[PDB]
Design a protein around this ligand. Sequence first.
Ligand SMILES: NC(=O)c1ccc[n+]([C@@H]2O[C@H](COP(=O)([O-])OP(=O)(O)OC[C@H]3O[C@@H](n4cnc5c(N)ncnc54)[C@H](OP(=O)(O)O)[C@@H]3O)[C@@H](O)[C@H]2O)c1
Ligand code: SF4
Ligand code: SF4
Ligand code: SF4
Lengths: 176, 147, 204, 111, 75, 106, 88
Amino acid sequence: TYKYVNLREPSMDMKSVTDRAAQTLLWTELIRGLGMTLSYLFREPATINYPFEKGPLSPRFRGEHALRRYPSGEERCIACKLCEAVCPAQAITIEAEPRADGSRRTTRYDIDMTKCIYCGFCQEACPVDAIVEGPNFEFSTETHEELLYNKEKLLNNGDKWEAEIAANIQADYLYR
Amino acid sequence: EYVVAKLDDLINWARRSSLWPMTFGLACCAVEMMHMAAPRYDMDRFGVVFRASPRQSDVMIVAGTLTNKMAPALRKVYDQMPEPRYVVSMGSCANGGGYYHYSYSVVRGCDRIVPVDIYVPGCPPTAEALLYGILQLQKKIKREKRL
Amino acid sequence: TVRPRNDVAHKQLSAFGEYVAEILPKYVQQVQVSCFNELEICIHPDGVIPVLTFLRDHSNAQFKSLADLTAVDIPTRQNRFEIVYNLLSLRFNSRIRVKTYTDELTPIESSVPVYKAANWYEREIWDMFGVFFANHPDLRRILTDYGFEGHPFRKDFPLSGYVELRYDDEVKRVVAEPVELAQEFRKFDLNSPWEAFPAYRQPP
Amino acid sequence: VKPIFSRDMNEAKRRVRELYRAWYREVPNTVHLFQLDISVKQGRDKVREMFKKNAHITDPRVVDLLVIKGKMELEETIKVWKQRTHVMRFFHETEAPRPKDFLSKFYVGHD
Amino acid sequence: LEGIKDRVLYVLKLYDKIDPEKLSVNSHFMKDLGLDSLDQVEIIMAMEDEFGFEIPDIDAEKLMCPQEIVDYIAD
Amino acid sequence: TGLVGLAVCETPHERLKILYTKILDVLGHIPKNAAYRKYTEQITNEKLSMVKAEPDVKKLEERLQGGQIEEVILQAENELSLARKMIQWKPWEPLVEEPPASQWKW
Amino acid sequence: ASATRFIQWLRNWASGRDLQAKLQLRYQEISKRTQPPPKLPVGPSHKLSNNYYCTRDGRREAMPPSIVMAVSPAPPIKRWELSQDEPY
Ligand SMILES: NC(=O)c1ccc[n+]([C@@H]2O[C@H](COP(=O)([O-])OP(=O)(O)OC[C@H]3O[C@@H](n4cnc5c(N)ncnc54)[C@H](OP(=O)(O)O)[C@@H]3O)[C@@H](O)[C@H]2O)c1
Ligand code: SF4
Ligand code: SF4
Ligand code: SF4
């Protein structure tokens, strides 16, 4: 509702002119600029020592891809290819086959980290809640081969993070 | 001998202590790169400084997308770098093109132009995960320079 | 009822569907479209400069500002390109669209003397689409490479391109270009059967 | 009544002659000021192979559009923009092509 | 007059497109000497660069014979 | 006094009256039966009747203009250039140009 | 010295009032693990009877009418007065 920026020359005569002239003959505003930085030094630095202190995070966080399973064994993923179609990077590749014993499950399951923008659609499009995004950062590699995750073999190694996953999903059902 | 092996540890420790980067912008990643400067996730706690110094710098951190126009631009910079040099691909674009992998104008993830030593996986590479671009690099310096 | 949006200013805005049409040139008007309080006018390519001088500093319609200069590429028609001049009035607070049509390779009358911002968007269309503009000062490639073949958007050629792969090979400084191999794009055949909408289907 | 781009039928060919005249004088500038790379003689042969592909002259509009395109891709090296030998290299040198033969292409793998 | 007939003949023979016995002074490049349509543009460019570059597109059509080309350059 | 834009911070009255009287003569050269002459005249004479009624009033400057009096004159300055361009290149009177091919629906 | 009592006088003295609202400012009223499990409320649907999609049209009125081939586009944008909270 119309604010203005310019003051349009506040100085008029004697008292209002000389003090504005004072901050050009001597400095004062440099001392006033020094004052804000002085108070900033004395207050404690808000720093986190990474290998010992950790930065604050959420109950629902996306970063690491790992496929969950049922409490009584059994691979939770069904090979719907649903998560493939939603995937905006088209990162997740899937080949489906029957497991010779009635059940319809996975054979090839590559989610390459060369692609994937960590959007978390595959977390939210899965009807069985197979892919749950684990709060992890510890996956920096030397090679591409070491980076792109293979057919479930490195994703079912996400069972080592499933203790956090089962606790963090307790915020997902009945959302936050 | 034992004296030579311990001396090679001191040369490796000189780089393990301090790494001075030439951080490439040209990305949404560049903001998360600027979050290293942010006090909450401090990086000047290490021997790393945001003075850059393009000719002097050791470890160039390629952040994000590399287009065909910027493809010869980054290569000529890498040649001007001193011999103990490392390349950190920061973000999914710098790895293998997170998005824009199937686009015409984007080079498919840095390695086709410049060799990458340490890969940082995340789109917005969180300042938590980005401290594996320093500490894991410092851990990886063993080299085993025998002769 | 909760969930839909209500419209009331449609009749007040429909008056311009008569006003600009009552000027009545075969040189300009042709077809007038108006829906959800927005006006679409498609104008013959021969007149673009005399059309955009109008709606500029005119007492009834004072736009003065050009925000978007988007172009629609469509292979169905003989006239392939549908260049849309999107105008915005700051005095009257209303938006209008000045649509045009150009075929495979024909120059349109460029709005450089009318708008000073047009030239940057005009270079963008010549890059992406290949539509040349007459009476234009310094037509240059901005988004494309300095040695790029074809036009990046055109629906004639694929998404991945042709000179996509770039190696730092056996030659010390020269970056390779002409290799055409890439990882395959999974073109999903997604198109739902049964027409979802009435008042859109046309008889053959 | 109809657009003509720049020239009508005959004058469009003279614009190509004007384009060939300008681009023939710019190959010493792309060696001494830019980089040696290959040769002065092979650089002039690189011009001839480009125009031999455009042997299909049928419309004044098609020719003129190629002239305007030619007044940008070859104008790029006159007022020198960022290329640095990696860009502005039209001739393929890195990749070796397979010859068009029924016995050669079938042995390697084609179609 | 003597310099124009000596410099242009030496420049035409150096191009190696036509034999010295085939083209001497009066033998035209259009039919007699045996030169292509692109070769006529190349020969006119090489002859202008040696003596003094001032060749327009309109004069290129008139310049077909080497004797006529020497007269056009002198005038 | 201070104008918003780069237009001079001054209010020249009757200078606006000169410009509006000039453009009425410009409109009556070639278009006479055309609607462009018909529609512009009924807006300009409507404004001229309100300018002549109230001199140097802030309410008079606010009449279908919004901003300053100099800004209203700037909104009529290029209107003379628009009228002159309409006289040189005229689509208001003739209609002869070719209709497009029957395809516009998406 | 690292004692807060003497330091708080210095930071208050050197340009502007401080004391309250620290640089870190994550001491009190920062709830960890959010809250006990909540129940998300339902909208105008979910409850049965008179929940037809015939009434909830959504995507129905969309067809564009072709028009024709002194009037203003809108009542002119009148300028708003200066702010009462701050004049300049
Ligand atoms: N133009 C010419 O100079 C020329 C002329 C005629 C023939 N040739 C032949 O072509 C070849 C060209 O190679 P080059 O001379 O260019 O090689 P080079 O530059 O001398 O480099 C040799 C590399 O191979 C490794 N290497 C060699 N012998 C090794 C051993 N016994 N155990 C472990 N690592 C070994 C070394 O690694 P470490 O340092 O880690 O051991 C070294 O990095 C030669 O073998 C030569 O016979 C060359
Ligand atoms: S991850 Fe979920 S959505 Fe994807 S195939 Fe497995 S069960 Fe289906
Ligand atoms: S997080 Fe998004 S981009 Fe990554 S695999 Fe899942 S759906 Fe694809
Ligand atoms: S990885 Fe994500 S944040 Fe980084 S440049 Fe690519 S899209 Fe932007």
